[PDB]
Amino acid sequence: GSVVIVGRIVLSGKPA
Amino acid sequence: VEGEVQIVSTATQTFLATCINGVCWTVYHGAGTRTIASPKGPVIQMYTNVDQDLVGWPAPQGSRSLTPCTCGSSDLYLVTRHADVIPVRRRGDSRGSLLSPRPISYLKGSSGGPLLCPAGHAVGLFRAAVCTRGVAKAVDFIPVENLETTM
Ligand SMILES: [Zn+2]
C-alpha cells in the first residue's frame, strides 16, 4: 500500500 | 500556505508526519516500509530505521520544514492531529511528562507529530503515549538528533 496525505497543519496559524 | 505537519493515513490507520530539514519523518509503526503518494506516483523512503521507529521520505508538496531545536529547553509542546498544543516537561533524552494528563483518546492519531520547544523548533518526533489506565500522562519521543544522525 501507500501512505497518503489527508491534510496539513501550519504551526503559525498562517491563513494567507 | 505551507504546512510543517502532514496528517497521513494508511489503509489501517491515521497518524502524522513532520518535515524536518527537507525530509518528511514519521513513525515506522505507522508507515512501515510503505511508500508515500505523489501525483507522479509513489516515492520510496529515503531513510528507514526500525530501531528508532523512524522512517523518512522526501518532503512532499505543500510542506515546509521545521528547524531543529538548539536552545536545549525542557518545556516542550506536543502538537496533535487536531492542531491541539499540549505542554510537556522533558524528563529525559526521549521522554517528557504532560503538564496535564489527558485521556489517551486525545493523543490518538498523533504519532509522528512534533514535540516543539519555546521557539517552535523541533525537539523530537512524538513516538508513543505512556498511559496509566487510559490516561496519557507522559510520552516517548525520538530526539531530532537521531534524525540529524540518520541523515
Ligand atoms: Zn529550542
Q: CA dist B114 to B42, B62, B86, B132, Å?
A: 24, 17, 11, 22
Q: CA–CA separation, B127 vs B110, rounded Å?
A: 9
When the candidates are 3.40.920.10, 2.40.50.180, 2.40.10.120, 3.40.50.10800, the CATH number that belongs to B1-66 is 2.40.10.120
Resolution (A): 2.3
Q: CA–CA separation, B39 vs B51, rounded Å?
A: 31
Q: Is B82 a catalytic residue?
A: no
Closest CA to B79 of B4, B142, B1, B2: B4
- Residue recorded with cell 509513489: B42
Q: CA–CA separation, B19 vs B90, rounded Å?
A: 22
Is B19 annotated in a binding site? The answer is no
Q: B25-46: buried (b, 16+ CB within 10 Å) or exposed (e) per residue?
A: bbbbbbbeebebbeeeeeeebb
Cβ–Cβ under 8 Å, residues B54 and B150: yes
Give rounded-to-5 percent helix, strand, coil for chain A.
0, 50, 50
Alpha helices in chain B (DSSP H): 28-31, 104-107, 144-150
With an 8 Å Cβ cutoff, are A8 and B7 in contact?
A: yes
